[PDB]
């Protein structure tokens, strides 16, 4: 059986779908991953995956998300129109080859790909890369129950700052809010609704959505073949192997978020004076905002500054004591499933809500208070590395790690749901 997979062209959307594809290929399915030209330019390793990679045009002018940032309203619709045309053309080509495609798993943020799947005679599966708790907000947004203290069914009481952040996007704010709510615009017509979460993590909201539509919780999809992009694996893991247990702060703001030069100074000085060992991912295009001699010498005593790391392998390493994170869902879930407590500095979109869930529901991290000054960051490091509170957060993270292991092992909710999905296709 031949499965097609089409993530949104950003790493936090590609990676969790890639991990699901790797699981499905292990069960015997043929996988074709559909990527933009822009994404393929960053792909460095793929041979070991055995997955076919097929590229489509970017569909907007010539990094594709940085062109999209210039005018989200216009360029997301241009990307949509081009994606519809070019995925149609690609499927038409794939229909001249055996085995014929049978299902298209597509990013939930591109709900209009469902029309392409059905027009081509394929089943359509929408893949949600955010937790059900956050996705629920987007549904209520579409229904008009909420726009842009807040009570919503089966969610903790939220402060305004805890709702998904779109005001940060300025003139793009309206376009981004529309994109998020539209994830539910055709949910009744989707053949399969997949969420990268596990039931025990959000019992009540999963049960609530399950009462409206049959949904399949299949997360964590995360488990070499684990990475498509350059991860600097040998440098990172040789350095971690030199650190004792529970001594390293891992720091990453993901694949998209950019901090101002003012904000990165506060992070830099906070890390130096904590006198903690640290591994800080600073993307190549963001290095020029680091203080003068930070990467070259003053970080050399206690730190590793790297433009990308193998995040799954880093979070699994016993040396890592905590994870200073922007709270994107992959990072949150990967830390939770690795037993690693967090320092939350959310930037925008669902990160704000994820940070609330981390601190107050799952209780595996602490939040910083706003610019975030270095003094606040060092305080949070002390709470997690030294204080009794940090030992509680660590124990809580280990309990969630155990429940996530249960979910993906035989008999667990996510294993059962991936089995149900696989069997449905046969």
Ligand X SMILES: C[C@]12CC[C@H](O)C[C@H]1CC[C@@H]1[C@@H]2CC[C@]2(C)[C@@H](C3=CC(=O)OC3)CC[C@]12O
Nearer Cβ to ligand X, position 168 or 298? 168
Q: How far apart are the first and last CA of the chain?
A: 8
Q: Return the residues of window 242-261 that contact ligand UDP according to CB under 6 A.
A: 252, 254-257
Tell the smallest beta-carbon distance from residue 171 to ligand X (Å): 10
Q: Does position 109 bind ligand X by CB under 6 A?
A: yes
- CA gap 17, 6 in Å, rounded: 8
Q: Does position 10 bind ligand X by CB under 6 A?
A: yes
Q: Is the CB of residue 216 less than 8 Å from the CB of residue 413?
A: no
Tell the smallest beta-carbon distance from residue 168 to ligand UDP (Å): 13
What SS3 class is residue 61?
coil
Instruction: Please give the structure tokens belonging to residue 41.
Output: 């330019």
Q: Does position 8 bind ligand X by CB under 6 A?
A: yes
- Supply the DSSP symbol for 134: H
Q: Return the residues of window 278-337 that contact ligand UDP according to CB under 6 A.
A: 281, 308-309, 311, 328-331, 334
Nearer Cβ to ligand X, position 171 or 388? 171
Q: Does position 383 bind ligand UDP by CB under 6 A?
A: no
Nearer Cβ to ligand X, position 110 or 240? 110
Stretch that binds ligand X, among 30-38, 175-183, 272-280, 385-393 (CB under 6 A): 175-183
Q: Which residues pair with 2 in a beta bridge?
A: 30, 101
Q: Is the CB of residue 104 less than 8 Å from the CB of residue 6?
A: yes
Nearer Cβ to ligand X, position 184 or 421? 184
Stretch that binds ligand X, among 66-74, 270-278, 382-390, 400-408 (CB under 6 A): 66-74
Tell the smallest beta-carbon distance from residue 15 to ligand UDP (Å): 3
Long-range contacts of 380-385 (CB under 8 A, 24+ apart): 380/324, 380/343, 381/249, 381/270, 381/274, 381/276, 381/322, 381/324, 381/343, 382/274, 384/321, 384/322, 384/341, 384/343, 385/249, 385/274, 385/276, 385/321, 385/322
Nearest C-alpha neighbor of 4 from the set 133, 92, 134:
92
Sign of CA dihedral 61, 58, 76, 18: negative
Q: Of ligand X, ligand UDP, none, which one sits near residue 330, judging by CB under 5 to 8 A according to partner kind?
A: ligand UDP
Q: Does position 65 bind ligand X by CB under 6 A?
A: yes
Q: Is the CB of residue 239 less than 8 Å from the CB of residue 400?
A: no
Site residues, ligand X (CB under 6 A): 8, 10, 65, 68-69, 72, 109, 130, 169, 172, 176, 179-180, 256, 349
Site residues, ligand UDP (CB under 6 A): 10-12, 15, 252, 254-257, 281, 308-309, 311, 328-331, 334
């Amino acid at each position: 059986i031949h499965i097609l997979a089409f993530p949104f062209p950003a790493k936090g959307h590609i990676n969790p779908l890639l991990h699901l594809c790797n699981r499905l290929a292990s069960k015997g399915f043929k996988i074709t991953l559909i990527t933009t030209v822009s994404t393929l330019k960053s792909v460095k390793t793929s041979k070991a995956n055995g997955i076919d990679i097929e590229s489509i045009p970017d569909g907007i002018p010539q990094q594709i998300i940085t062109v999209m940032e210039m005018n989200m309203e216009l360029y997301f619709k241009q990307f949509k129109a081009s994606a519809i045309e070019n995925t149609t053309k690609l499927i038409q080509k794939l229909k001249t080859k055996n085995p014929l495609p049978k299902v298209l798993i597509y990013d939930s943020s591109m709900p209009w790909i469902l029309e392409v799947a059905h027009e081509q005679g394929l089943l359509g599966a929408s893949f949600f890369t955010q937790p059900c708790s956050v996705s629920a907000i987007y549904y209520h947004m579409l229904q008009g129950t909420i726009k842009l203290m807040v009570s919503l069914p089966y969610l903790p009481l939220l402060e305004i700052k805890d709702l998904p952040g779109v005001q940060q996007f300025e003139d793009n704010s309206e376009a981004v809010a529309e994109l998020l709510a539209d994830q539910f615009s055709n949910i009744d017509d989707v053949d399969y609704v997949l969420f990268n979460t596990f039931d025990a993590l959000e019992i009540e909201v999963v049960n609530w959505m399950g009462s409206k539509w049959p949904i399949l919780t299949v997360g964590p999809t995360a488990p070499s073949i684990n990475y498509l992009f350059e991860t600097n694996t040998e440098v990172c893991m040789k350095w971690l192997d030199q650190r004792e247990i529970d001594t390293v702060i891992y720091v990453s703001f993901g694949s998209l978020a950019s901090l101002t030069e003012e904000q990165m100074e506060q992070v830099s000085q906070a890390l130096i004076r904590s006198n903690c060992y640290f591994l800080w991912v600073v993307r190549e295009e963001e290095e020029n905002k680091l203080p003068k001699d930070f990467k070259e010498t003053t970080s050399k005593k206690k730190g590793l500054v790297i433009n990308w790391c193998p995040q799954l392998d880093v979070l699994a390493h016993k040396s890592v004591a905590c994870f200073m994170t922007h709270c994107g869902w992959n990072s949150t879930l990967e830390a939770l499933c690795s037993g690693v407590p967090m320092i939350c500095m959310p930037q925008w979109a669902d990160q704000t809500t994820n940070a609330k869930l981390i601190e107050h529901v799952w209780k595996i991290g602490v939040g910083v208070n706003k610019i975030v000054k270095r003094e606040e960051i060092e305080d949070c490091i002390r709470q997690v590395i030294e204080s009794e509170r940090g030992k509680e957060l660590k124990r809580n993270a280990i309990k969630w790690k155990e429940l996530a292991k249960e979910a993906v092992s035989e008999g667990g909710s996510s294993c059962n749901n991936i089995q149900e999905f696989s069997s449905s296709l046969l």
